[PDB]
Amino acid sequence: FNPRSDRFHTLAFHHVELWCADAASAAGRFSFGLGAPLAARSDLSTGNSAHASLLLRSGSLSFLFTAPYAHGADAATAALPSFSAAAARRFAADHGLAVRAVALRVADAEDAFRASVAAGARPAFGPVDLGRGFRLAEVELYGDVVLRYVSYPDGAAGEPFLPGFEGVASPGAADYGLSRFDHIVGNVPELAPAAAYFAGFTGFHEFAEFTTGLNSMVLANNSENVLLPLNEPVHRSQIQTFLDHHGGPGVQHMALASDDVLRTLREMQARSAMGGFEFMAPPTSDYYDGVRRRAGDVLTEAQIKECQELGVLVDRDDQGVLLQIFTKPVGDRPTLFLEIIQRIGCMEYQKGGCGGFGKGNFSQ
Amino acid sequence: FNPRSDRFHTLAFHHVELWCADAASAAGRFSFGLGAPLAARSDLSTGNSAHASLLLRSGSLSFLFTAPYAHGADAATAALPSFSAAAARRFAADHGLAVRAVALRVADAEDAFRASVAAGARPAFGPVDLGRGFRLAEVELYGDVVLRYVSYPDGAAGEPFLPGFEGVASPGAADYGLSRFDHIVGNVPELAPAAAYFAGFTGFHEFAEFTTGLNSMVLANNSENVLLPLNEPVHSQIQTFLDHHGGPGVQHMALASDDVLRTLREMQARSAMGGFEFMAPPTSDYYDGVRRRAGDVLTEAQIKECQELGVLVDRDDQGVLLQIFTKPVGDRPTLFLEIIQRIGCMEYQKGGCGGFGKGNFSQ
Numbered sequence: 001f002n003p004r005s006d007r008f009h010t011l012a013f014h015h016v017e018l019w020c021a022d023a024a025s026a027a028g029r030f031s032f033g034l035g036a037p038l039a040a041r042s043d044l045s046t047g048n049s050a051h052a053s054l055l056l057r058s059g060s061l062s063f064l065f066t067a068p069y070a071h072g073a074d075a076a077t078a079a080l081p082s083f084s085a086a087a088a089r090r091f092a093a094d095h096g097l098a099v100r101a102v103a104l105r106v107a108d109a110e111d112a113f114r115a116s117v118a119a120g121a122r123p124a125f126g127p128v129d130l131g132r133g134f135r136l137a138e139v140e141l142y143g144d145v146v147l148r149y150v151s152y153p154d155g156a157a158g159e160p161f162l163p164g165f166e167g168v169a170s171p172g173a174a175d176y177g178l179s180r181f182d183h184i185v186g187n188v189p190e191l192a193p194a195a196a197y198f199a200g201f202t203g204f205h206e207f208a209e210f211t212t213g214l215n216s217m218v219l220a221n222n223s224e225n226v227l228l229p230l231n232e233p234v235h236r237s238q239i240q241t242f243l244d245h246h247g248g249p250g251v252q253h254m255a256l257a258s259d260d261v262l263r264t265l266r267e268m269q270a271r272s273a274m275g276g277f278e279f280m281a282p283p284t285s286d287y288y289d290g291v292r293r294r295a296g297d298v299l300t301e302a303q304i305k306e307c308q309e310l311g312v313l314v315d316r317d318d319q320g321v322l323l324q325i326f327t328k329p330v331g332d333r334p335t336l337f338l339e340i341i342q343r344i345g346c347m348e349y350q351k352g353g354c355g356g357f358g359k360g361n362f363s364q
Numbered sequence: 365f366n367p368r369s370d371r372f373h374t375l376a377f378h379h380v381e382l383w384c385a386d387a388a389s390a391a392g393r394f395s396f397g398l399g400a401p402l403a404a405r406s407d408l409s410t411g412n413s414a415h416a417s418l419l420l421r422s423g424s425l426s427f428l429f430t431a432p433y434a435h436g437a438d439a440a441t442a443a444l445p446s447f448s449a450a451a452a453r454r455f456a457a458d459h460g461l462a463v464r465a466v467a468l469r470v471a472d473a474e475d476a477f478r479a480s481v482a483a484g485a486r487p488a489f490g491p492v493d494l495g496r497g498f499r500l501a502e503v504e505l506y507g508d509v510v511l512r513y514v515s516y517p518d519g520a521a522g523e524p525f526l527p528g529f530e531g532v533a534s535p536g537a538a539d540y541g542l543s544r545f546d547h548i549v550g551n552v553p554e555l556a557p558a559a560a561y562f563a564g565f566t567g568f569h570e571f572a573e574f575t576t577g578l579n580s581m582v583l584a585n586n587s588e589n590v591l592l593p594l595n596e597p598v599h600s601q602i603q604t605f606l607d608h609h610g611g612p613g614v615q616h617m618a619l620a621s622d623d624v625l626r627t628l629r630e631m632q633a634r635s636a637m638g639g640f641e642f643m644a645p646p647t648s649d650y651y652d653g654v655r656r657r658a659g660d661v662l663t664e665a666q667i668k669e670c671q672e673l674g675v676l677v678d679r680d681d682q683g684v685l686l687q688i689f690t691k692p693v694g695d696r697p698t699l700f701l702e703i704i705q706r707i708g709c710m711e712y713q714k715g716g717c718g719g720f721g722k723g724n725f726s727q
């Protein structure tokens with residue numbers, strides 16, 4: 001059942017912004033670890049004396065890393081009008097490396113902002129004109145994470161990012177096959193008030209529910225190409241550990257999709273030792289006898305063999321299979337981690353959520 | 365002239381520690397950018413809930429990256445007893461990614477501390493025993509940068525780093541040939557008072573002085589294997605550092621390799637995908653000058669490779685310096701790196717062989 005109850009036209013994921021201690025360090029390591037070359041910048045070298053922002057890109061995946069300058073800063077040169085230097089300094093201290101903004105492209109950032117706050121959204125940054133048709137607004141998502149709306153005409157899709165961001169070419173830099181954001185998951189202490197608030201102001205509909213040490217709900221836009229789950233603890237748990245160390249609600253993981261995840265993972269795992277991302281240790285060997293039974297009709301024996309070699313997990317639902325693997329936490333604290341995935345099947349384009357989210361795997 | 369006036373036995377550089385709000389990002393990028401595999405850690409996984417510390421090593425070169433935990437942090441579990449979460453949070457807000465500690469191995473950290481403050485050093489952390497014979501002490505160097513003394517018996521050497529740190533094996537991880545710290549440079553608004561204070565409490569002796577716009581003074585220990593220069597601006601690149609850093613601090617660290625061109629080939633191969641960028645190569649007429657000045661030391665092939673990589677060549681009395689500088693290593697136009705090789709002065713190699721690049725201010 002899809003009621004298509006979006007209160008505003010929600011087109012797709014646009015970017016994720018991490019407010020960093022040092023944007024050069026975080027973007028540099030993520031570039032190497034993910035195979036996502038630098039694609040745009042706004043900083044002192046482009047006339048922005050308020051914040052340093054670096055935009056990494058792989059396929060349609062856009063990661064924005066932003067840090068505040070401390071001295072000589074003219075707040076009027078910020079390419080992101082919502083930026084506040086003291087808020088970013090506090091944010092990095094409160095959390096370590098952490099997602100500040102989940103950004104969706106909407107038909108009209110002002111219309112989405114107005115509809116959101118009328119339906120209970122706590123305003124974060126009222127809509128502004130970024131220039132030549134670009135609009136931006138923010139509302140509170142959970143904790144100190146904001147849901148950012150950006151809008152611009154389709155004819156502007158050739159531009160690097162947002163006004164004020166200069167493009168950066170990547171001639172001698174190829175990617176590792178990461179193609180798109182699939183889902184972004186938040187942890188909250190109480191799912192029911194947080195889901196009621198968030199689904200309430202967006203009109204996003206329940207896509208999936210898993211109850212089980214967590215209770216989870218997946219919220220989706222009309223087309224279900226925007227997937228934004230929320231988790232709560234039950235009652236020591238993985239969700240509570242996050243909340244304690246993080247200091248509040250926050251983004252727990254971002255799932256990044258590839259059309260060939262085994263090839264992507266071989267490249268990422270070659271980088272782990274020297275400063276890329278380490279991955280969770282592979283399951284016991286009997287896990288993959290299970291994979292042969294549950295998915296041996298759609299995965300070849302060789303593919304399952306590669307899955308075992310690289311440690312990837314396999315789950316399946318009705319007519320779809322999910323390959324997934326998780327990184328260890330990507331900052332200092334046991335909080336944020338990444339999920340790298342491939343979805344197989346549900347070609348009806350591919351229907352969102354094909355293969356589910358890995359519920360079958362929590363018996364590791 | 366070397367008066368060998370050290371107030372305490374100063375053995376060698378031991379490590380440099382950067383304070384950060386995010387150690388994992390900085391140590392991650394430095395690891396593949398410089399080719400320094402992770403070699404030790406102290407954090408939640410080792411029983412330390414106060415700070416997360418990552419130790420990168422390449423040869424004798426050791427970089428420590430430390431960030432405070434924010435919630436449920438028990439300061440009493442810190443592996444670094446001088447660590448203070450409140451001071452580290454202030455440090456990151458004030459400076460961004462920046463050097464906090466320049467650490468020297470001394471014969472006895474307690475004696476080095478006592479003799480220093482007796483000679484005017486502003487104390488920063490009184491000497492403490494870390495166990496297994498390790499002692500640690502800190503005095504103020506300039507601004508918020510401390511000079512850290514560490515001492516331990518030579519039968520300890522095989523310990524990963526300091527007590528409380530757990531080794532990281534990094535299975536088949538390879539370095540890019542960086543082998544040791546050559547010198548570490550601080551910027552200050554006024555050279556004469558800063559040097560009077562610093563040379564005063566250490567007994568380090570003046571090794572060289574230069575005028576560019578900057579005035580500089582190199583201080584050295586007795587053996588001259590520890591080189592700690594200071595710059596002031598001329599009333600500028602130095603003032604831009606002070607403005608954006610918020611005060612005095614470490615401007616650059618020079619990292620030596622026994623084969624800098626091979627090292628730089630590996631570092632520059634990492635630039636496009638998140639490694640460090642380097643200052644652009646000088647124009648071809650500069651390298652005609654290198655041929656005139658250094659054709660008795662470098663081959664034509666080396667000079668052509670220097671040009672390809674952008675490395676600068678300078679020379680003093682019977683020594684040659686090969687050096688190249690990175691762009692700033694973080695967001696702010698503050699800290700940067702110098703990658704070098706020294707050629708000649710084999711009498712081991714005499715410290716400071718070939719100078720610091722005073723010639724290279726014309727290119």
Ligand SMILES: Cc1cccc(C)c1-n1c(=O)c2cc(C(=O)C3=C(O)CCCC3=O)ccc2n(C)c1=O
Binds near residue numbers: 357358362
């Ligand atoms: C990575 C890790 C570290 C330490 C402890 C644990 C449980 C895990 N961990 C996961 O966090 C995990 C998450 C999902 C999944 O991504 C999904 C949530 O289950 C709720 C719905 C939406 C979201 O997409 C699936 C499988 C998982 N598995 C199997 C796993 O082991």
Ligand SMILES: Cc1cccc(C)c1-n1c(=O)c2cc(C(=O)C3=C(O)CCCC3=O)ccc2n(C)c1=O
Binds near residue numbers: 601
């Ligand atoms: C890298 C960069 C960026 C923007 C502006 C400039 C001047 C530079 N820059 C340097 O900072 C630089 C520093 C030294 C040198 O390392 C040395 C100082 O000259 C004083 C003595 C101790 C110290 O070790 C030598 C050559 C240099 N050159 C050639 C150079 O261009």
Ligand SMILES: [Co+2]
Binds near residue numbers: 183185253255339357
């Ligand atoms: Co997931």
Ligand SMILES: [Co+2]
Binds near residue numbers: 547616618
């Ligand atoms: Co130098």
